[PDB]
C-alpha cells in the first residue's frame, strides 16, 4: 500500500553484519574508494498479503537479493532495499514521456505550463527508473510449487516533493562535497579546507539573481552548534558568508585551527541573499574531523 525513501549517513562499522542490506552496502563501500557512503538511500516498502497461508517473498533488485522473510496471514513486513542516487548530469530528465498511439490528436493543446510539465516529467521518470529494476518472486510455505511473480505498476501510485528530493539530487540547488587534509590534526596547526560547488539544472528557475550566499555552521558532534564567536573552538580566518555565483565551479577554500577538543563536524547552508528568511537549501553533506 505505501512506500517511503530515507537516506543514511553513518558508516556502519562491523559486527552488525547479520542484517541483509548492511553487508552488501558496506561491501560496496569497503573497497572501491570512489564508491563512497553518504549517498545511499534506503527505500521502505511494506508487503501485506490478504490470504490464509504464509508466503516467503524474496525481493530481487538488479544485483541486490534480499533474505527470506515470512509474512503469515494479514501482517506487514517492511523489506528494506538499498539503492544509490541517480545522477542528474549523466542523464536527461526533461523529455516528454511518449504515448503508445500515433493516431489520435489527444487534445494537442495540452493544458500545462513549463515548470508543471517538467516536474511531471521528473515525477514520472523517477518511478520509471525505480520500477524497471524491482522484482519479487514469492512462494507459499505449505504448498511449495505455486511460485509466482508480482508486478509493481498497479501498486506504486505517484511521488511527492520528498521522494523527488531524496531519489533525485538534481531537484536540489547546488552540488557540494568537501575536501579536508588531515582529520587527526594536533591543536597547534592550521589546515586548509575546500568546498567545491557545482550548480544544478534548476538554475533556470530564477535566472535573475546571479549570486547566492554560502553560510557556514559548526556543531559539536553531540548537538547544539557553536555561535560564531567560536572561543574554545575553531579559530577561523575570513568570515562565514562567502558569496558564490550561478554556473560556476567555485572553491571557497578556507582555514581552520582548533583550540580545545576533538569532535567537530562541518557543513554549509545556502540563503540566496543576506537578509533573514531568504533561505532555500538546508544542505547536509556534513563531514567530520578530530583533534587530539
Amino acid at each position: 500500500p505505501s512506500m517511503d525513501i530515507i537516506p543514511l549517513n553513518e558508516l556502519f562499522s562491523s559486527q552488525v553484519e547479520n542484517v541483509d542490506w548492511i553487508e552488501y552496502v558496506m561491501s560496496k563501500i569497503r573497497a572501491e574508494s570512489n564508491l563512497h557512503s553518504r549517498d545511499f538511500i534506503l527505500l521502505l516498502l511494506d508487503f501485506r498479503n490478504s490470504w490464509i497461508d504464509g508466503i516467503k517473498l524474496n525481493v530481487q533488485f538488479e544485483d541486490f537479493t534480499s533474505n527470506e522473510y515470512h509474512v503469515e496471514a494479514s501482517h506487514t513486513s517492511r523489506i528494506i532495499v538499498p539503492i544509490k542516487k541517480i545522477d542528474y548530469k549523466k542523464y536527461n530528465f526533461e523529455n516528454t514521456p511518449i504515448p503508445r498511439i500515433f493516431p489520435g490528436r489527444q487534445f494537442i493543446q495540452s493544458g500545462l505550463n513549463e515548470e508543471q510539465t517538467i516536474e511531471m516529467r521528473q515525477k514520472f521518470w523517477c518511478r520509471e527508473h525505480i520500477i524497471s529494476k524491482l522484482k519479487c518472486n514469492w512462494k507459499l510455505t505449505t504448498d511449495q510449487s505455486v511460485t509466482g511473480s508480482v508486478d509493481f505498476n498497479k501498486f506504486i501510485e505517484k511521488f511527492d516533493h520528498k521522494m523527488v528530493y531524496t531519489i533525485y539530487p538534481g531537484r536540489l540547488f547546488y552540488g557540494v562535497q568537501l575536501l579536508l587534509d588531515e582529520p587527526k590534526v594536533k591543536v597547534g596547526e592550521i589546515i586548509n579546507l575546500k568546498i567545491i560547488t557545482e550548480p544544478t539544472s534548476t538554475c533556470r528557475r530564477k535566472q535573475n539573481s546571479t549570486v547566492n550566499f554560502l553560510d557556514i555552521v559548526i556543531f559539536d558532534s553531540k548537538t547544539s552548534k557553536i555561535l560564531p564567536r567560536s572561543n574554545r573552538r575553531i579559530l577561523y580566518n575570513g568570515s562565514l558568508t562567502k558569496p558564490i555565483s550561478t554556473t560556476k565551479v567555485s572553491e571557497i577554500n578556507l582555514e581552520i585551527i582548533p583550540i580545545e577538543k576533538g569532535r567537530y563536524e562541518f557543513s554549509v547552508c545556502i540563503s540566496k541573499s543576506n537578509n533573514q528568511d531568504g533561505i532555500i537549501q538546508f544542505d547536509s553533506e556534513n563531514v567530520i574531523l578530530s583533534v587530539i
Binding site: 559539536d220 548537538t223 568570515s239 562565514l240 585551527i257 543576506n274
Partner: protein, 282 residues
C-alpha cells in the same frame, strides 16, 4: 598583515591573512568578520612587546565609482582620447555627488544608484562648454546607472591597480595577567543517575587582581540532569592556595572555587600569567 617588534623573540605568527583571490569584504554589522592569529610564546617569559598591524583597504563607494568610471563612460580609449581627458576633474566633481544606493548593493545588486538628482545635471553640463560628443555619453551613462545592477564578477577586473589603498595600522601590546598558578585536580563521580556522559573542559585561565580568588565551573552534562554528584581530591600542586569545596554535585550550580590571591604568589612565568587547571575525572 601583522608585524613583530625589534625585541625579536621566536614569535611564530602562522596566521597571516592575504585576500589575494577575493577583493571582497563587507562590514555592515549584520554578519561578523573575525580575523585571528596563531602566534607563539617567546623562548622565556615575555609580557610587554608591541604589535602593529597593516590593513590595506578601500571604501566601496569609490570601488563602485571606479567601476562606473572605467566601464560606464570611459570604457574604450576612443572616448578617453578626447571626450573625458579634457574634463576629468569635472567628471570627478560630477561623480562626487552621485550617491549610489549602498543599501541594496549588498543584496543581489552592484553599481545601482539611489534616487539622487538627475534633472539639473544636464543643465549644469550644458552651462559650460561641454561638447555633445561627451554630453551624450555622460547623460547615457547616468541614465543607464539610474537603473542597472552588476554582479561580483568583473569587479576585481576594474579594481585591479586602480585604487590607492590606505594601509592603516593600530597598536596591540599583548596584555598580561599578574598571578601565575599551576594546579591539577582529579575526580571520582559517585553516581546518582548511572552516567549522563558529560562533556569536559580543562581550563587554563588566571585571575589578575589583589585580595582575589580563582573560581571554576564544572563540566557540562547533556543527558538526564540534576544528578551525578562528583567527589574530588585536590592535590593543589606548586602553590599553597585556599580551597573552598569538597565532594560537590555536577548539576545546575556547584562552583568549586579556590581562593588563590592571598599567599605564596609568583611572577609572570609566561607571556601572561597562567593557571592551567587540568581536571581528570578518571
Amino acid at each position: 598583515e601583522l608585524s613583530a617588534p625589534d625585541t625579536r623573540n621566536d614569535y611564530n605568527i602562522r596566521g597571516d591573512y592575504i585576500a589575494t583571490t577575493p577583493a571582497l569584504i563587507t562590514f555592515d554589522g549584520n554578519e561578523s568578520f573575525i580575523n585571528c592569529y596563531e602566534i607563539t610564546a617567546n623562548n622565556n617569559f615575555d609580557s610587554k612587546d608591541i604589535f602593529n598591524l597593516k590593513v590595506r583597504y578601500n571604501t566601496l563607494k569609490e570601488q563602485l565609482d571606479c567601476f562606473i568610471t572605467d566601464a560606464v563612460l570611459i570604457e574604450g580609449d576612443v572616448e578617453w582620447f578626447i571626450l573625458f581627458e579634457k574634463w576629468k576633474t569635472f567628471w570627478e566633481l560630477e561623480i562626487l555627488k552621485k550617491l549610489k544606493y549602498d543599501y541594496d548593493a549588498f543584496k543581489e545588486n552592484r553599481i545601482i544608484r539611489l534616487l539622487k538628482t538627475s534633472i539639473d545635471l544636464n543643465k549644469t553640463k550644458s552651462k559650460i562648454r561641454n561638447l555633445c560628443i561627451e554630453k551624450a555619453v555622460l547623460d547615457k551613462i547616468l541614465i543607464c546607472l539610474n537603473k542597472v545592477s552588476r554582479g561580483i564578477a568583473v569587479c576585481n577586473t576594474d579594481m585591479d591597480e586602480y585604487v590607492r589603498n590606505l594601509v592603516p595600522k593600530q597598536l596591540t601590546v599583548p596584555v598580561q595577567l599578574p598571578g601565575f598558578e599551576q594546579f591539577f585536580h582529579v575526580q571520582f563521580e559517585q553516581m546518582e543517575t548511572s552516567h549522563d556522559a558529560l562533556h569536559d573542559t580543562i581550563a587554563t585561565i588566571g585571575n589578575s587582581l589583589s585580595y582575589t580568588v580563582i573560581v571554576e565551573n564544572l563540566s557540562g552534562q547533556w543527558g538526564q540532569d540534576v544528578i551525578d554528584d562528583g567527589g574530588y581530591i585536590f592535590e593543589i600542586l606548586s602553590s599553597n592556595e585556599w580551597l573552598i569545596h569538597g565532594q560537590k554535585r555536577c548539576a545546575i550550580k556547584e562552583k568549586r572555587k579556590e581562593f588563590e590571591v592571598h599567599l605564596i604568589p609568583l611572577k609572570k612565568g609566561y607571556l601572561n600569567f597562567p593557571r592551567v587547571e587540568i581536571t581528570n575525572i578518571n
